[PDB]
Design an enzyme around this catalytic site. Structure first.
Site, PDB file in Angstrom:
ATOM      1  N   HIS A   1      -1.418 -30.169   0.093  1.00 48.15           N
ATOM      2  CA  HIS A   1      -0.469 -30.137   1.157  1.00 48.15           C
ATOM      3  C   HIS A   1       0.837 -29.421   0.751  1.00 48.15           C
ATOM      4  O   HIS A   1       1.451 -28.699   1.538  1.00 48.15           O
ATOM      5  CB  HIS A   1      -0.107 -31.581   1.521  1.00 48.15           C
ATOM      6  CG  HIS A   1       0.811 -31.710   2.695  1.00 48.15           C
ATOM      7  ND1 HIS A   1       0.455 -31.313   3.957  1.00 48.15           N
ATOM      8  CD2 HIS A   1       2.030 -32.300   2.838  1.00 48.15           C
ATOM      9  CE1 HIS A   1       1.405 -31.597   4.807  1.00 48.15           C
ATOM     10  NE2 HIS A   1       2.345 -32.207   4.178  1.00 48.15           N
TER      11      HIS A   1
ATOM     12  N   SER B   1       4.750 -29.096   7.600  1.00 46.41           N
ATOM     13  CA  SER B   1       4.345 -30.571   7.956  1.00 46.41           C
ATOM     14  C   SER B   1       5.124 -31.085   9.213  1.00 46.41           C
ATOM     15  O   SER B   1       4.977 -30.433  10.365  1.00 46.41           O
ATOM     16  CB  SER B   1       4.422 -31.477   6.729  1.00 46.41           C
ATOM     17  OG  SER B   1       3.655 -32.635   6.973  1.00 46.41           O
TER      18      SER B   1
END
Ligand SMILES: O=Cc1ccccc1
Ligand SMILES: O=Cc1ccccc1
Ligand SMILES: [Cl-]
Ligand SMILES: [Cl-]
Lengths: 259, 259
Positions: B236, B81
């Site tokens: 995610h 990320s």
């Protein structure tokens, strides 16, 4: 269905509220409420243990949790290891807020000797610290003794029955802590009217390699409990190695104090 | 035995080294070495984010990790990320210590626009932040935009395919962070000779609700990678929802950069 309960879970020194990540959803899936407290300088609290100098300061988040409960609510208060000392301190303050104290592989203090008594006994007895690092820090009121577990120590004495992931997780999160032995030595005895008035039970792991089975009978002999539950195959970190059996034990306890 | 590698893993904003607790033993069981960096004000790092005023300060523990490696060692550097940004900053300082950069559900910056460019682009079209709390902190470096994830937002958009236990763990460990978007927008552009010279691959999850497919394709189109790997069903937080499949991806990358 049965009336459900609010469990307040208190972790051990050098650890944090994260230890309960398997148990909390088990209890909540059964309808119970759970608060996992994070003690001072523990877990993700960005305060070092050096700044917390007293067991009362350490325990404040637990005290605050109980104070914030609505009027007449009572909880099942579970203290793990050093958390035994925190729950006793809390029971001396808010005995009427606690349905029962659950000493989980925990230090069980008495109301006769100085509050450090059971910790001093364990330090005299215990020979497996391994790569644990002991240190001191001087405060304006005296020496504060500190400890940071070593990873070999952790694996051998606390996590030997846990999944390897749980050990890896602990390696990434454990912190320098304290058992506040000097502070507890100077503190007033726990009282009969507070702490000693509260119902208490003991839950022990059959393969605890830091709080040995005999040391537990010695503590329970010095200060009796209503009932002892045994988790078969648990290491010290029984909420990580045997979370479903710990859930079983706490569900039996909740059934016993039908609230 | 095929020769093994040293993986350096870099977590995302508001999280810490702990997120790799599942992946790390999988990699180590296969013979690899793994270093899970804890960035500044992250995880159990003793600073608050308010004390970490620039992205260079935030990234310092990764820079130190790379600086400390023995002569001629090279690593597989995995950025997750906002960790795509950290690993780019690292590659611009120690390109020769990195065998390949792995952008895992990550921001992939380029060498043409300011370093904040791919973040600014996502932030403009991001969708809901839900119960996330935004705050400002004024410093000698200007004003820092802080955020603290809310739990509904985590559940819906980060952790939707993760076991309930991982979600509860994250609730107990996530912290206030920053994407440092102001500081990044005034930094010198990443260099073609440093960052741009290092091999890169992209690993994406199919169900990332934070970094959607079309946005990834836009980033790669602006800045090409050697190969793309997809983890089917990953949210995610793919190290938590599909760690085995993430292992399989990294293993395939390690065979591709053998020697
Ligand atoms: O059970 C908690 C504990 C913590 C540090 C050292 C030994 C035991
Ligand atoms: O991927 C990390 C992250 C953290 C906070 C908000 C959104 C994403
Ligand atoms: Cl303890
Ligand atoms: Cl991030």
């Amino acid at each position: 269905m049965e009336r459900k309960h609010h469990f307040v879970l208190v972790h051990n020194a050098c650890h944090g509220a994260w230890i309960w990540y398997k148990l909390k959803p088990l209890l909540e899936s059964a309808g119970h409420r759970v608060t996992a407290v994070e003690l001072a300088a523990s877990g993700i609290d960005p305060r070092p243990i050096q700044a917390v100098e007293t067991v009362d300061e350490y325990s404040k988040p637990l005290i605050e949790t109980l104070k914030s409960l609505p009027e007449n609510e009572e909880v099942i208060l579970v203290g793990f290891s050093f958390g035994g000392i925190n729950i006793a301190l809390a029971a001396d303050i808010f005995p009427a807020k606690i349905k029962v104290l659950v000493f989980l592989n925990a230090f069980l203090p008495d109301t006769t000797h100085v509050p450090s008594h059971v910790l001093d006994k364990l330090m005299e007895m215990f020979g497996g610290w391994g790569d644990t690092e002991f240190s001191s820090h001087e405060t304006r009121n005296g020496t504060m003794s500190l400890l940071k577990m070593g990873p070999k120590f952790m694996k051998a004495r606390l996590y030997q029955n846990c999944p390897i992931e749980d050990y890896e997780l602990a390696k990434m999160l454990h912190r320098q802590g304290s058992f506040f032995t000097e502070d507890l030595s100077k503190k007033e005895k726990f009282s009969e009217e507070g702490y000693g008035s509260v119902q208490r039970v003991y839950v022990m792991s059959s393969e605890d390699k830091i709080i040995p089975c005999d040391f537990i009978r010695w503590m329970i002999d010095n200060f009796n409990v209503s009932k002892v539950y045994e988790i078969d195959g648990g290491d010290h970190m029984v909420m990580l190695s045997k979370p479903q059996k710990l859930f079983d034990s706490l569900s039996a306890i909740a059934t016993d104090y039908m609230g």
